Design an enzyme around this catalytic site. Structure first.
Site, mmCIF file in Angstrom:
data_model
loop_
_atom_site.group_PDB
_atom_site.id
_atom_site.type_symbol
_atom_site.label_atom_id
_atom_site.label_comp_id
_atom_site.label_asym_id
_atom_site.label_seq_id
_atom_site.Cartn_x
_atom_site.Cartn_y
_atom_site.Cartn_z
ATOM 1 N N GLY A 28 0.859 -1.189 0.000
ATOM 2 C CA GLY A 28 0.000 0.000 0.000
ATOM 3 C C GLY A 28 0.883 1.223 0.000
ATOM 4 N N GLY A 30 3.164 4.075 1.205
ATOM 5 C CA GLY A 30 4.038 4.332 2.352
ATOM 6 C C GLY A 30 4.415 3.061 3.085
ATOM 7 N N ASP A 47 8.807 -0.588 -2.740
ATOM 8 C CA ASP A 47 8.929 0.824 -2.353
ATOM 9 C C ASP A 47 10.339 1.357 -2.616
ATOM 10 O OD1 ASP A 47 6.277 0.693 -1.471
ATOM 11 O OD2 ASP A 47 6.793 0.886 0.640
ATOM 12 N N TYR A 65 2.725 1.257 -18.407
ATOM 13 C CA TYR A 65 3.562 0.367 -19.226
ATOM 14 C C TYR A 65 2.736 -0.758 -19.863
ATOM 15 C CZ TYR A 65 3.472 -2.471 -14.921
ATOM 16 O OH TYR A 65 3.075 -3.219 -13.841
ATOM 17 N N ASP A 90 7.708 -3.700 -10.785
ATOM 18 C CA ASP A 90 6.444 -4.400 -10.559
ATOM 19 C C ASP A 90 6.575 -5.908 -10.789
ATOM 20 O OD1 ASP A 90 5.531 -1.777 -10.187
ATOM 21 O OD2 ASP A 90 3.952 -1.950 -11.668
HETATM 22 C C1 LIG Z 1 0.750 -4.649 -4.359
HETATM 23 C C2 LIG Z 1 0.394 -3.873 -3.094
HETATM 24 C C3 LIG Z 1 0.537 -2.412 -3.481
HETATM 25 C C4 LIG Z 1 1.686 -1.773 -3.594
HETATM 26 C C5 LIG Z 1 3.084 -2.377 -3.359
HETATM 27 C C6 LIG Z 1 3.783 -1.683 -2.186
HETATM 28 N N1 LIG Z 1 5.070 -1.910 -2.092
HETATM 29 O O1 LIG Z 1 3.170 -0.972 -1.400
HETATM 30 C C7 LIG Z 1 1.443 -0.509 -3.946
HETATM 31 C C8 LIG Z 1 2.268 0.525 -4.180
HETATM 32 C C9 LIG Z 1 1.766 1.780 -4.533
HETATM 33 O O2 LIG Z 1 2.606 2.840 -4.777
HETATM 34 C C10 LIG Z 1 3.309 3.354 -3.616
HETATM 35 C C11 LIG Z 1 4.292 4.380 -4.150
HETATM 36 C C12 LIG Z 1 5.556 4.291 -3.301
HETATM 37 P P1 LIG Z 1 5.319 4.824 -1.528
HETATM 38 O O3 LIG Z 1 4.806 3.550 -0.992
HETATM 39 O O4 LIG Z 1 4.369 5.934 -1.725
HETATM 40 O O5 LIG Z 1 6.733 5.149 -1.285
HETATM 41 C C13 LIG Z 1 0.381 1.921 -4.642
HETATM 42 C C14 LIG Z 1 -0.433 0.811 -4.388
HETATM 43 C C15 LIG Z 1 0.107 -0.373 -4.045
HETATM 44 N N2 LIG Z 1 -0.455 -1.558 -3.766
HETATM 45 C C16 LIG Z 1 -1.900 -1.821 -3.763
HETATM 46 C C17 LIG Z 1 -2.416 -1.953 -5.084
HETATM 47 C C18 LIG Z 1 -1.640 -2.169 -6.241
HETATM 48 C C19 LIG Z 1 -2.251 -2.282 -7.491
HETATM 49 C C20 LIG Z 1 -3.637 -2.200 -7.611
HETATM 50 C C21 LIG Z 1 -4.415 -1.993 -6.483
HETATM 51 C C22 LIG Z 1 -3.809 -1.874 -5.233
HETATM 52 CA CA LIG Z 2 4.315 0.691 0.551
#
Ligand SMILES: CCc1c(CC(N)=O)c2cc(OCCCP(=O)(O)O)ccc2n1Cc1ccccc1
Ligand SMILES: [Ca+2]
Ligand SMILES: [Cl-]
Ligand SMILES: [Cl-]
Ligand SMILES: [Cl-]
Ligand SMILES: [Cl-]
Ligand SMILES: [Cl-]
Ligand SMILES: [Cl-]
Ligand SMILES: [Cl-]
Length: 123
Positions: A28, A30, A47, A65, A90
């Site tokens: 999610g 952060g 992240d 992409y 990803d």
């Molecule tokens: C796969 C779990 C997930 C991750 C991976 C993760 N590593 O959190 C993720 C990263 C994001 O950017 C976050 C930008 C980076 P920061 O976390 O703001 O630094 C935004 C949503 C994210 N989701 C939920 C999701 C993904 C795709 C469709 C629906 C929901």
């Molecule tokens: Ca995260």
């Protein structure tokens, strides 16, 4: 965007993309404190991956992409290098999710982030 990453997650894991949102302490937007399990570590790494892309001048939260999935694996593509880089971050996360399906635990979905404790690991 997360349409793409989400679609990739569903293809590689057999689960809805929403089952990885808010999972543990890092899946999610952060994240902080210590990852709850290997799946959460995939998110910690992802992240970090996005942070590297940002430092390169990309906007990985926004990049759109192209990709396909065959028997041979995940193939990434896109007009720009930043789009392809975002796909690589990803891809690595989605493979990590698949590789750790064995310890995926439903109790960490929608994890209350007040339960996140301890230090924040470095990238
Ligand atoms: C796969 C779990 C997930 C991750 C991976 C993760 N590593 O959190 C993720 C990263 C994001 O950017 C976050 C930008 C980076 P920061 O976390 O703001 O630094 C935004 C949503 C994210 N989701 C939920 C999701 C993904 C795709 C469709 C629906 C929901
Ligand atoms: Ca995260
Ligand atoms: Cl990574
Ligand atoms: Cl971004
Ligand atoms: Cl495809
Ligand atoms: Cl692959
Ligand atoms: Cl570029
Ligand atoms: Cl479970
Ligand atoms: Cl499940």
């Amino acid at each position: 965007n997360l349409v793409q990453f989400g679609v990739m997650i569903e293809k590689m894991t057999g689960k809805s993309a929403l089952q990885y949102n808010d999972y543990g302490c890092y899946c999610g937007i952060g994240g902080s404190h210590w990852p709850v399990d290997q799946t959460d570590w995939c998110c910690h790494a992802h992240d970090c991956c996005y942070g590297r892309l940002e430092k390169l001048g990309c906007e990985p939260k926004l990049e759109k992409y192209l990709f396909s999935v065959s028997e041979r694996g995940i193939f990434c593509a896109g007009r720009t290098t930043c789009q392809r880089l975002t796909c690589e971050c990803d891809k690595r996360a989605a493979l990590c999710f698949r590789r750790n399906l064995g310890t995926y635990n439903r109790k960490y979905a929608h994890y209350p982030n007040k339960l996140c404790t301890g230090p924040t690991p470095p990238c």
